[PDB]
Amino acid sequence: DKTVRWCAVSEHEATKCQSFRDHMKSVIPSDGPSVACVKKASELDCIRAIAANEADAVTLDAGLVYDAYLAPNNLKPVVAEFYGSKEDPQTFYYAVAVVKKDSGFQMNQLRGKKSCHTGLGRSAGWNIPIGLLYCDLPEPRKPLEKAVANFFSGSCAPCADGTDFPQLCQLCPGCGCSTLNQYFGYSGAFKCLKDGAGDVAFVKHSTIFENLANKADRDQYELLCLDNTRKPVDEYKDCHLAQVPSHTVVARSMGGKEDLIWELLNQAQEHFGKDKSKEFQLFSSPHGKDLLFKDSAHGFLKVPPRMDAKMYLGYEYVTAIRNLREGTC
Ligand SMILES: [Fe+3]
Numbered sequence: 001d002k003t004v005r006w007c008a009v010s011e012h013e014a015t016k017c018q019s020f021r022d023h024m025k026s027v028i029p030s031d032g033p034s035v036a037c038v039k040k041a042s043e044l045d046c047i048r049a050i051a052a053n054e055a056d057a058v059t060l061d062a063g064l065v066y067d068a069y070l071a072p073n074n075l076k077p078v079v080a081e082f083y084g085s086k087e088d089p090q091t092f093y094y095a096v097a098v099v100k101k102d103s104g105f106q107m108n109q110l111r112g113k114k115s116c117h118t119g120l121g122r123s124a125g126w127n128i129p130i131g132l133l134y135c136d137l138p139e140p141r142k143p144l145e146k147a148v149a150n151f152f153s154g155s156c157a158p159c160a161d162g163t164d165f166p167q168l169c170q171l172c173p174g175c176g177c178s179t180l181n182q183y184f185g186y187s188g189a190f191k192c193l194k195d196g197a198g199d200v201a202f203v204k205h206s207t208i209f210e211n212l213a214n215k216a217d218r219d220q221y222e223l224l225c226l227d228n229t230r231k232p233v234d235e236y237k238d239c240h241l242a243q244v245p246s247h248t249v250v251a252r253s254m255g256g257k258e259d260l261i262w263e264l265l266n267q268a269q270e271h272f273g274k275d276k277s278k279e280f281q282l283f284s285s286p287h288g289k290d291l292l293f294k295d296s297a298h299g300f301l302k303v304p305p306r307m308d309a310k311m312y313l314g315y316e317y318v319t320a321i322r323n324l325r326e327g328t329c
Contacts, residue, residue, distance in 0.1 A: 001031045001032060001033055001260075002033060002034070002257070002260055003033070003034050003035070003036050003260075004033060004034070004035055004036070004056050004057055004257060004260050004261055004264050005036045005037075005038050005054075005055040005056045005057070006020070006035055006036070006037055006038070006055070006056070006057050006058070006292070007038050007040055007046035007049060007050065007055040007056075007057065007058040008037050008038065008039050008040070008292065009039075009040055009041070009042060009043055009045075009046060009058075009178050009179075010039065010040070010041060010178035010179055010180050011039070011179075011180065012178075012179045012180075012287050012288040012291055013039075013178075013179065013288075013291045013292055014037060014039040015287045016285045016287050016288075016291040016292055017035070017037035017292060018037055019280055019285075020035055020037075020268070020272075020280070020282070020292070021034070021035040021036070021037060023271075023272065023277075023279055023280040024264070024267075024268065024271075027267075027271050028267060032263075032267065033260050033263050033264040033267075035264065038054065038055045040055075041177070041178060042159065042177040042178060043058065043060060043064055043177070044159070044177070046058040047060075047064075047067070047068045047073050047075065047250075048073070050073075050075060050250065050251065050252060051072065051073040051074065051075065051252065053252070053255075056251060056252075056256065056257050056260075056261065057249050057250070057251055057257075057261050058249065058250060059081070059247050059248065059249045059292060059293050059294075060247060060248060060249075060250055061118075061119075061122045061123050061124075061247050062123050062244055062245040062246070062247065062248065062312075062313055062317070063121050063122045063123040063126065063127045063244075063321070064121055064122065065077055065245075065248055065250060065309050065312065065313060066309055066310075066313060066318065066321050067121060068250050068309065069308065069309030069310070074252075074253050075250040075251060075252060075253065075309075076250060076251065076252075076253050076256075076306070076307065076308060076309065077248035077249065077250050077303050077307065077309060077312045078248075078249055078250065078251045078256070078258045078261055078262065078302070078303050079248065079249040079261060079262055079265055079300045079301070079302055079303060080245075080246050080247070080248040080249075080300065080301050080302075080303055080312075081246045081247045081248065081293060081294055081297035081299070081300060082246060082297065082298060082299055082300070082301050083206070083246065083294075083296050083297055083298060084298065085298055086274075086298055086299060089298065089299065089301065090246075091245070091246045091301065092243045092244060092245055092246060093124075093204050093205060093206070093243070093244060093246065093296075094204060094205040094236050094237070094240040094241075094242075094243060095123060095124035095128040095129070095202065095203075095204060095240060095241045095242045095243075095244055096124075096202075096203065096204065096205050096207075096223050096224075096236050096239065096240045096241060097129060097200050097201070097202055097223065097224040097241060098190065098193060098200065098201045098202075098203060098207070098208060098221055098222075098223060098224075098233065099193070099199065099200050099201075099221065099222055099223070099224055099230070100193070100199075100220060100221055100222070101219070101220050101221060101222050103199060105199075106224065106228040106229065106230070107224045107225070107226060107228050108228050110133065110136075110151070110152070110200070111136070111151055111152075112152070112153050113152055113153065113198075113199040113200060114152060114153055114154045114155055114170070114171060114197065114198045114199050114200075115152045115155040115156075115198055115199065115200050115201075115202065116155065116156050116171060116183060116188075116189040116190075116192030116193050116197070116198035116200065116201040116202070117129075117155060117156060117157045117158065117189055117202055118158070118184070118185050118186050118188070118189045118202065118203060119157070119158040119159045119177065119184060119185065120145075120157050120158065120159040120160045120177075121159070123244040123245075124186070124202055124203055124204050124241075124244065125186075125189055125202045125203060126157070126202070127244075127320065127321060127324060128202070128241050128242045128244065128320075129202040129241060130144070130148060130324065131320050131323070131324055132226075132241060133151065134323075134324070134327065134329070135329035136151070137150075137151045138150045138151060141327075143164075144324065144325065145157075145160060145161070145164065145165040145168060146165065148165075148168065149165045149166075149167035149168050150167075152167070153167075154167050154170035154171060155167065155168055155170060155171055155198065156168075156169065156170070156171035156172035156175070156183045156189070156192050156197070156198065157169070157175060158172065158175050158176060158177050158178075158181050158183065158184045158185075158188070159175060159177035160175045161175070162174055162175045171183065171192055171197040171198055172184075172192065172197075179288050179291070183197075185289070185290055186203045186204055186207045186210075186289070186290060186294075187203075187207065187210065187211055187289045187290065189201045189202065189203050189207075190203055190207050190208065190211055191211075194211075200224065202241075204296070205236040205237075205240065206296040208221060208233050209233075210289070210295060210296065218233055218234075219232075221233050223235070223236060223239045223240070224239075225238070225239035225240075226239075226241065244317065245312065245313055245314065245317065246297075247293075247294055247297070248303065248312065249261060249265070249300075262302050265300050266300065266302075268282055269282060269299045269300055273298070273299055274298050274299070283295055283296075283297050283298070
């Protein structure tokens with residue numbers, strides 16, 4: 001029963017945040033918790049702000065959860081999104097590589113292609129695909145951006161430094177790290193492919209389904225599998241790059257209001273979860289896709305007491321991330 005300062009990244013998320021706040025007021029008693037909205041330019045800024053006691057919560061892709069746990073931020077995950085359905089919640093998802101039908105190349109022929117990424121340091125759009133191509137990348141592999149810029153003949157990697165690596169923002173000038181960059185995120189990375197700027201988009205299994213309603217439109221796309229073959233977008237379970245942890249809401253390790261955060265989100269998913277309301281929806285919005293939370297999420301699950309980021313992500317994934325900034329071949 002106090003205020004939770006939610007960190008909204010840019011204009012769109014801010015708008016949804018304002019709606020979230022108002023609708024919650026109309027249904028949460030006077031002794032219930034409330035939402036306040038803080039607008040930031042990026043997720044990176046949100047991490048700082050929470051650590052500096054300027055905000056209290058923000059949902060992050062598991063890839064960014066690692067950087068949020070690192071000093072001097074020291075944030076911890078408190079609430080996780082789950083996908084699939086309520087009967088059988090999936091606390092993970094599939095990273096896939098989407099391409100257009102008959103484009104003519106396999107996984108082993110990516111050098112020279114144009115790639116569309118959700119964002120720098122993110123699970124599906126960066127960490128996984130780059131981790132798999134790592135050794136096939138040219139040297140030096142430090143900084144990593146360098147190698148990626150030289151592997152592909154241009155790409156869109158939101159949040160990257162366009163000054164230092166201009167090839168990385170070739171498909172999306174500036175490399176905007178928010179929805180203001182139309183090619184940002186899952187659906188942004190997909191549009192980058194659909195519009196014809198890129199040859200491959202690294203997103204999740206639900207992305208194409210979230211964007212193309214007709215099975216006939218989806219039939220014009222395919223998935224690149226690790227065995228250098230292609231498969232239909234609905235056969236992602238046999239044709240994906242990896243399984244990664246679900247997105248999660250992070251908070252301060254000290255005086256982080258984890259109790260209020262859970263109390264709020266739990267009431268939120270009950271009143272405005274999937275199919276629960278005509279006035280407001282927590283997992284969709286006329287203002288855009290994946291705002292504040294993923295459209296593909298069906299609810300939340302409280303993370304076990306005082307769990308750290310390494311434990312949440314898993315040693316295998318943590319290990320994958322570490323090598324990404326070091327590794328040999
Ligand atoms: Fe993600």
